[PDB]
Design a protein. Structure first.
Ligand code: DMA
Ligand code: DMA
Ligand SMILES: [Ca+2]
Ligand SMILES: [Ca+2]
Lengths: 328, 292
């Protein structure tokens, strides 16, 4: 049995920096156009684990930063994340996010998209203030790669003959890259050698793969009330993810017409989800997904080998295990 | 006094070829539908006014370097991204093709900033990041006032300044700063772009006869019984009734003249620059914004 980890040590070590990050967040979500801070705070104040800014903070302190200018980057990262949520929820048609109704059901799809565009621009304004051209290139690139991954998913995730390799390419782009960017931007703020920033980048990329694999498994195996979003969104969208792909592969010839109807032609009821959830758990497909996630978590922990075994390093190792073990 | 758009287009030929090559190259992805969907909007737009601003401003400010071409291309990406996020349509779910438009928009927005990073110009990035922010505020404001019967002239101007003119101003200002000129020079060129943007929009509002002409007519056709009465009707049979209220109250004429005032302001902003082909082409453009 693998270690649980936790976020607790990370959160506690980063407390003094996150108060600065949260101050920037509340500040930059402000606008004279009143819908903007209303829509934004509905999402931001609703909750969220803040893992991405936490990783920027952790990476900066592990790399030994001498000022706190990384806090603006951490704030920018959360805005980028927040914006991608607004856009992704509109695209996927999801009804719940962080325990609240998805913003686009209250303010409309257009306003959700536009407020996302606001946050994206606010994120770059913040980065400009830090004067770190390298950190700005890192997050500009990450943001482009997210969009590419989302398009790739839109084009290719909606048929059952999706390969594992294309799936891993999608999750690397749409999810793991922002984690890699968050750590790498944190590291470059500190003004370090490329070996350290590359190591931290490596940590975040692998953490994000583990993270997304666990998220995909949680979509079938989690409870809506702990997740803050509807279990079964992927299935009801007709979106193939690894747990589904692996389950199809163990299922034999007898289930092929069920998937074809529910996913390929996308004809569904609520009963189809309960049937799918059972076939994903029972076939061990959920477990195999998490085995792969744990493999990526090991890679994330090994990526930090060059760093001193201090509290920041231990916090990041515990986060790697947490990425796989978490329920939300 | 007519002017042209054609004079600047011809002057900016050698520069715009390099801009269009950057535009084509940077829109590419290993994800095939991204450049396919982007080229549909880009190549079938024709005019390229916003990147022209950047080319023209950098040339008038006497740029020795090449950097403005990447900023010009980035400006077109931002412009295209904003167009992609407009057609999206409480309207909860996306129209067909809406999903790709959101995400290709996100791609181009991000590509623009990558392109700008390549110039190493932190001032240019600052200008365009702020522009992007203001545009997004302008677009949110327009949508929360899309219904509005009683929208004042001032607030409408604030909307179009943010959602249309700001990009023209930012394109010009960014072009100027890539030339390495002083603040007075970049400020003037910024002002040219801003006023030009306003002049284009207001004449476009006039060339269509919830814009300024209708807003003025309703404000000049008395209180709530041709205000809320027109707003309740706000079809094709119902059209020429409000047009009569537009012309007859002198609202269409008030729009055209305001448009011209903005064009003159644009021209007056260029007065510190040498009276050369670039300046005269920009002067002619300001007149074109009104005549066309
Ligand atoms: C890509 C992905 C799974 C996004 C949701 O992120 P998260 O689980 O970190 O969300 P939150 O910020 O709400 O904790
Ligand atoms: C915002 C983003 C990059 C989402 C991708 O992952 P997902 O659709 O699995 O996330 P969620 O389940 O949080 O909607
Ligand atoms: Ca989603
Ligand atoms: Ca998910």
């Amino acid at each position: 049995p693998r270690k649980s980890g936790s976020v607790d040590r990370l959160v506690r070590l980063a407390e003094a920096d996150m108060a600065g990050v949260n101050r920037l967040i509340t500040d930059r979500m402000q606008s004279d156009v009143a819908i903007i801070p209303a829509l934004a705070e509905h999402l931001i104040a609703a909750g969220g684990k803040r893992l991405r800014p936490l990783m920027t903070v952790a990476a900066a302190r592990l790399a030994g930063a001498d000022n706190d200018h990384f806090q603006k980057l951490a704030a920018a990262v959360e805005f980028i994340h927040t914006a991608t949520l607004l856009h992704d929820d509109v695209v996927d048609g999801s009804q719940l996010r962080r325990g609240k109704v998805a913003a686009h059901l209250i303010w409309g799809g257009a306003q959700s998209v536009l407020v996302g565009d606001f946050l994206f621009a606010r994120a770059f304004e913040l980065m400009v203030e830090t004067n770190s051209m390298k950190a700005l290139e890192i997050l500009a690139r990450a943001s482009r790669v997210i969009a590419e991954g989302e398009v790739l998913q839109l084009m290719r995730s909606h048929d059952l003959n999706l390969s594992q390799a294309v799936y891993l390419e999608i999750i690397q782009a749409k999810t793991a890259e922002l984690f890699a960017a968050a750590s790498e931007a944190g590291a470059v703020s500190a003004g370090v050698d490329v070996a350290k920033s590359e190591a931290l980048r490596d940590y975040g990329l692998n953490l994000g793969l583990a993270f997304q694999l666990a998220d995909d498994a949680l979509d079938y195996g989690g409870a809506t009330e702990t997740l803050g979003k509807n279990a079964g969104d992927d299935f009801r969208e007709g979106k193939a993810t690894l747990p589904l792909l692996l389950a199809i592969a163990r299922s034999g010839p007898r289930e092929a017409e069920f998937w074809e109807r529910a996913i390929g032609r996308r004809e569904q009821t609520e009963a189809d989800f309960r049937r799918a959830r059972e076939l994903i758990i029972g076939s061990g497909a959920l477990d195999a997904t998490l085995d792969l996630a744990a493999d990526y978590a090991d890679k994330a922990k090994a990526a930090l080998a060059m760093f001193p075994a201090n509290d920041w390093r231990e916090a990041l190792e515990e986060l790697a295990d947490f990425a796989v073990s978490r329920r939300a």
